[PDB]
Amino acid sequence: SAIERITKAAHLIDMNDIIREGNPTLRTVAEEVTFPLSDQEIILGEKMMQFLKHSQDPVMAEKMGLRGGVGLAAPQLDISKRIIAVLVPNITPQEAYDLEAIMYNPKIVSHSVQDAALGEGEGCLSVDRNVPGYVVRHARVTVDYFDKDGEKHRIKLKGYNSIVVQHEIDHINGIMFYDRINEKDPFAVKDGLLIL
Numbered sequence: 400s401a402i403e404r405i406t407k408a409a410h411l412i413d414m415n416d417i418i419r420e421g422n423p424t425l426r427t428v429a430e431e432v433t434f435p436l437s438d439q440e441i442i443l444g445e446k447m448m449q450f451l452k453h454s455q456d457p458v459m460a461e462k463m464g465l466r467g468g469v470g471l472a473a474p475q476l477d478i479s480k481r482i483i484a485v486l487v488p489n490i491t492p493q494e495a496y497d498l499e500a501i502m503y504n505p506k507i508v509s510h511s512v513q514d515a516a517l518g519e520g521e522g523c524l525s526v527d528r529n530v531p532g533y534v535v536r537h538a539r540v541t542v543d544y545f546d547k548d549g550e551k552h553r554i555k556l557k558g559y560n561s562i563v564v565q566h567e568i569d570h571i572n573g574i575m576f577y578d579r580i581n582e583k584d585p586f587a588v589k590d591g592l593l594i595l
């Protein structure tokens with residue numbers, strides 16, 4: 400299985416572990432994890448974060464053939480579990496990362512009326528092509544999740560962090576970024592939509 404393969408001590412996640420469009424796992428609703436977590440579920444989250452860090456190191460990324468990424472969801476590894484990792488760099492920054500988290504069973508429990516979209520659109524490590532347009536999301540979200548120790552966290556996100564976490568939560572619900580582009584005018588700006 401993918402989880403057995405990926406959670407070996409020696410394994411480094413790379414693009415050959417990341418499934419692409421067409422694989423039905425990307426369109427399936429992922430299963431909640433139960434607590435306590437298995438060792439494999441803990442290691443998996445750690446391996447996903449290690450992938451993100453490798454992908455943001457230009458030297459390592461070049462050596463491993465990685466596309467640089469800011470989030471990853473377990474279904475993208477063919478693992479239908481509600482586990483995500485997010486690593487959003489800060490834009491000379493005092494700290495490297497705006498947000499660094501491995502989240503188990505993440506859930507949006509509140510959201511703003513205002514919407515938001517990245518001005519440059521979105522891409523996805525599972526999508527080997529460009530789809531232009533504003534990916535319409537909630538501007539701000541309150542997210543509950545559990546950490547690898549089983550502790551519950553409630554966080555509030557805005558800006559880029561909010562977008563990234565919603566992209567990954569979509570993956571665990573079988574949703575892809577282009578599902579949220581307006582089919583009639585990909586660059587429409589509706590009332591209450593904040594373009595970032």
Ligand SMILES: O=CN(O)C[C@@H](CC1CCCC1)C(=O)N1NCCC[C@H]1C(=O)Nc1ccccn1
Pocket residue numbers: 455466467468469470471472475488520521522523524525562563566567570
């Ligand atoms: O499910 C998760 N994914 O599909 C990986 C995606 C997640 C983000 C896309 C937009 C919102 C969340 C991802 O990270 N990207 N999209 C594919 C290739 C580019 C890459 C990216 O934005 N890279 C980046 C940006 C700034 C700094 C460093 N790297």
Ligand code: NI
Pocket residue numbers: 522523524525566570
């Ligand atoms: Ni994606």
